[PDB]
C-alpha cells in the first residue's frame, strides 16, 4: 500500500489491515472517522482499480442503486468498494437514500422497479474529526459527525466495523517506504479473487461467541474475522492464536459501534459487554475499547455501586444505573447476566418501593415514572444474585433526583417484609471496596456483630454507616 | 488538658474558611511531633457524644483497637472516621 | 503578452512569469489578489485560446465538473486554464461543489 511498517506500531498495522478488509469480504460496510491527513482516502482512490471514491457523498439513488429509466444497475453493481469521502456533508434529495442503503446493508439485495437485484459492493464511510476523541465520548456519541438524517440506530446497526482513525498517526514523509513491495495491480487482483472465498467459520474450530452478541453482532464479527483471515492467511493453514487475535480485533471494533448504538438508542443496546469463550479450556475473555473505578464526587443520581459475592463466591463490585422517565410505573432490567435470581430480587425491591413510596419520597408517585435499571460489572468477577436492597436504593435515588454520595458502596440485602441480612465475607468486601476506591460504606445493623472480624488497618478507612430497616438504608446511603 | 488536636482542627477551619462537618466530635490528642494518642475512656466519650446529639465521630487509627470494647448499639449510631496523623485528622474534619 | 520589459522591475517580471505558470503545468492551482486595474485578467481572456475566464464564479457543478444528464464532462475536461474572476462572490448552489 506504500507505507513503511517499521515506523508504525503493530496496532497501527492492524488498523491499516482493517482498512484493506472492505476489499476482500463481500458486502462489508465499514465507517472510519479520524483526524485530517491520516491517509484515509489513498487506498480507495489511487491504489485499486475496483474501488470508487464518491466525492462529497452527494449521490442520487438512481445513480448508486438503479436507474429505472435506463434499466442500468447503479454503482454497487460495478465496484467492489464504494467509499463516501467527507461523510459530514451528505444530504439526499431522495430521502429514500437512507432507507435504500439500510435495506442493502441489512440484506445485500434491494428491490427497485420490478426486480429484486443483489449486489456485492462493500460500502466505506470516511470522515474527518475536528475535536478530541475524549470530549466526543464524554459529551456525545462518536457518530456525531455523521449527518443528522443519517444518525439512526437502525442505520448504524448495519455497520460491520468502526475504525479508530485517531489511533493512526498523522501521515509524514518518514512513513513512506523505499523498499520492494507488491504491485498494486497484483494486490487488487489478489483482493478481487479472494472475495470469492469464505473464512468466517474458522472461529468455530477454536472459539465460541459470547452471550452479549445478537444476530447482527455475530454477522459483523464473522465478516470482519473472515476479511482479516483472508488478508493474512490466504493459504488456509493457521493456528488457534491467530484466530484469537483476529477475533479480538473484530469484537473490539464491533464493540465500538455497539457503544455508540447504546448512547444513541437507549434501551435496545445495553448488551455491550462483548466477550468470547474458548472451546478447549472453556475460560472466558472480555474485550474492551482502548479509548474508553469509582471517581470522586457525586455521580449522576440513580447511579450507585454495590458489592457482593459472585456465583463463584468471590467478592465483586457492580455499578447499577437507573434511568427515570415519565411513564406508568414500568420496570425494565438489563445487564443482570440474564440471572433469574437478580431479576426477582429487583422485582421484590420494586414491589417494596411501590408499597413504601410515601415514607421515602415524601410525595413522589412511583407509578407516574418508568425506570430502567442496568448492571455493569467493574471487576469481571461474575454474576451477582442478591440485588434487592441496592436496587431499592437506586430506585429512591433516581426518583427523588438527588445523587448518591461520593464513593459509597451499599451493602446488605433486604426481604419483602423490611428485614435486613448480614453481609458474608465483610472483610473481603471492605478489601475490594478500598481497592475499588470506595471510602464510605453503609452496613446493616445486624452485620455489626462481625465488626471484630475486620482487621484494624482495613476498617480505619471507612466512615461506616449502620441502618436498621431498608428505609433507613436508603436515607443513609442517599444522605 | 487534651486540646492539641481540636486546636489544630480549629486553626485549620478558621484559616481555610471551611466550616467543619455538622455534628462531628473530634477525639484523641497529639504531641508536638504529631504522634497521635489513643482516646481515653472511648466508650464513655461516645456515650456523651450520643447524649449531646453527635452524629459523626473522628477517631485516631490506634484507637480502633478499643472499638471491640464499644457497645454495639452505641457504635451503630455514628458515622465513624479513623484518621492516621493530625493532618489526616484535619482532612477528615474538613471533608 | 504586449508588456514592456524595460519599464518593469525584475521582481514584477518574475511575477508576470508566475502568471503564465498555470498554462505550462498540468493541474496547477494558483490564487492572485490585487488592486483593481493591475491587468490580472487580461492574459487569461485575451492572450490565449486555451484558457477560459469563468466570469462571476456562480457556475454550477454540472457545468464545471460533470453533467450526468448528458454524461459529458464539464469545463475542466476542455480548457487548460480555468480562471475564476471576482473570487469574492463565487458561490455554489450545490453544497458538494
Numbering used by the authors:
A (entry chain I): 195 to 486, 491 to 677
B (entry chain C): 583 to 677
C (entry chain J): 195 to 291
What does the paper say about this structure?
Bacteriophage exclusion (‘BREX’) systems are multi-protein complexes encoded by a variety of bacteria and archaea that restrict phage by an unknown mechanism. The final gene in most type 1 BREX systems, termed ‘BrxL’, encodes a large protein (670–700 residues in various species), with much of its sequence predicted to adopt a fold corresponding to the chambered ATP-dependent AAA+ protein family, which are involved in a wide variety of cellular functions throughout all biological kingdoms. In this study we have demonstrated that the BrxL phage restriction factor is a multimeric DNA binding protein that displays ATP-dependent assembly on double stranded DNA.
To study the structure of full-length BrxL we next purified two constructs, wild-type BrxL (BrxLWT) and a variant containing a catalytic point mutation in the ATPase ‘Walker B’ catalytic motif (BrxLE280Q). Grids generated using BrxLE280Q also displayed a mixture of partially and fully assembled protein complexes, with the latter displaying protrusions from each end of the long axis of the complex. A subsequent CryoEM structure determination of full-sized particles produced electron density maps extending to ∼3 Å resolution that correspond to dodecameric particles comprising two six-fold symmetric (hexameric) protein rings, again associated with one another in an antiparallel tail-to-tail arrangement. In addition to the difference in protein copy number and symmetry between the unbound versus DNA-bound BrxL protein assemblages (corresponding to two heptamers versus two hexamers), the BrxLE280Q density maps also demonstrated the unambiguous presence of double stranded DNA spanning the length of the BrxL chamber, which would seem likely to represent DNA from the bacterial expression host that was bound by BrxL during expression and/or cell lysis and then carried through the purification process. The density of the DNA was not of sufficient resolution to directly determine a specific sequence of the bound DNA moiety, and so the modeled identity of bases in the refined model represents an arbitrary sequence based on the best fit to density at each position. Approximately 6 full turns of DNA (62 basepairs) were visible and modeled into the density. The dimensions of the BrxL (E280Q) dodecamer are ∼195 Å in the longest dimension and 140 Å across the exterior diameter of the cylinder. The diameter of the interior chamber is narrowest (∼30 Å) at each end of the protein assemblage, where positively charged loop regions from the NTD and AAA+ ATPase domains of each subunit are in closest contact with the DNA, and considerably wider (∼80 Å) near the chamber's equator, where the C-terminal domain of each subunit makes contacts with the same domain in the opposing protein hexameric ring. Multiple contacts to the DNA backbone, at each end of the bound duplex, are contributed by basic residues extending from loops contributed by the NTD and the AAA+ domains.
